[PDB]
């Protein structure tokens, strides 16, 4: 099911947290001077690169991640053997998508023991994890996790790929309570006919979970469509094809541009 247009307000929240995502691809380029840049999280061998971040405004302790930006990224992005959530064996069955767990493997410490470390100073902030393309099934696997020590964390993703199978899905829409938009806290953005959020095929075992916020052009609030449940519908009806146009450009910003 779906309706169309969203607040002002949360339109505004997607489009910062598009930001971030889409500058983490240039060194978290022209973010809002609102923000407080953190350690640089980063592993040699996946090349998974990203930040935590801090915003005293809106009082909140901020996990990026980038998408590829190497063939190293690429392998990762292109291997769908699903694998055992084996980091969080309390998620009952759940398996995830094999290349992006290798890169949430090679970085969990260093992102576990920073959030902990902010987290106990700032013990009133929201956690919220965010990404693009790979980087958004990072912050997924990093949202699942977290969530398990921490009440308040919340995730916003742009682009994101079928993360891991039906079980992770189930475990995410529970921990996020995804069973109506008025209280998720796992905002699945997509945009027109991006070809990503088609990958990898649900007939290999994988599924999305998470409220799906459909950009469709020209982008706005109105323009933005709510779409609810597991029918083929808004970016997955779409039929894109890969890396296309509508998954570079989310909000008019494309990865790693800097113009804005
Ligand atoms: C795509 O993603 C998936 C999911 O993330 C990856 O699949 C996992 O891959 C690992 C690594 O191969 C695999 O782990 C093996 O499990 C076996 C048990 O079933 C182990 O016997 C095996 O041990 C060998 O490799 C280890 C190093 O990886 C060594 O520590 C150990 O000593 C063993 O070493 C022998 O064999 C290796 C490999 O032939 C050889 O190099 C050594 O010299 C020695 O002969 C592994 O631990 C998991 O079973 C996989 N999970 C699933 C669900 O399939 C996959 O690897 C990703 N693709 C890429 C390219 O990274």
């Not at 696997?141 to 020590?149: D, E, V």
Request: hydrophobic share 30%.
């Amino acid at each position: 099911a779906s309706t169309q247009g969203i607040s002002e307000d949360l339109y505004n929240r997607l489009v910062e947290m598009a930001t971030i995502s889409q500058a983490a691809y240039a060194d978290l380029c022209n973010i809002p001077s609102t923000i407080i840049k953190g350690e640089k999280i980063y592993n040699a061998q996946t090349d998974i690169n990203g930040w935590i971040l801090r915003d005293d405004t809106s009082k909140e302790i901020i996990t990026v991640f980038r998408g590829t930006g190497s063939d190293t990224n690429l392998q990762l992005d292109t291997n769908y053997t699903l694998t055992p959530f084996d980091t969080l064996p309390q998620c009952n069955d759940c398996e995830v998508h094999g290349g992006y767990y290798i890169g949430w493997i090679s970085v969990q410490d260093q992102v576990e023991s920073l959030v902990k470390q902010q987290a106990s100073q700032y013990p009133d902030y929201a956690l919220t994890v965010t990404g693009h393309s790979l980087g958004a099934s990072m912050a997924a696997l990093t949202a699942a996790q977290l969530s398990a020590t921490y009440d308040n964390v919340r995730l916003y993703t742009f682009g994101e790929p079928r993360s891991g199978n039906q079980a992770f899905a189930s475990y995410m829409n529970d921990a996020f309570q995804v069973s109506s938009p008025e209280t998720t806290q796992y905002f699945r953005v997509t945009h027109s006919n991006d070809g990503i959020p088609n990958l990898p095929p649900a007939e290999q075992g994988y599924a999305h979970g998470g409220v799906e916020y459909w950009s469709v052009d020209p982008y706005s609030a109105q323009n933005t469509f709510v779409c609810t449940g597991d029918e083929v519908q808004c970016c997955e009806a779409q039929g894109g094809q890969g890396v296309n146009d509508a998954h570079t450009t989310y909000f008019g910003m494309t990865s790693g541009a800097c113009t804005w």
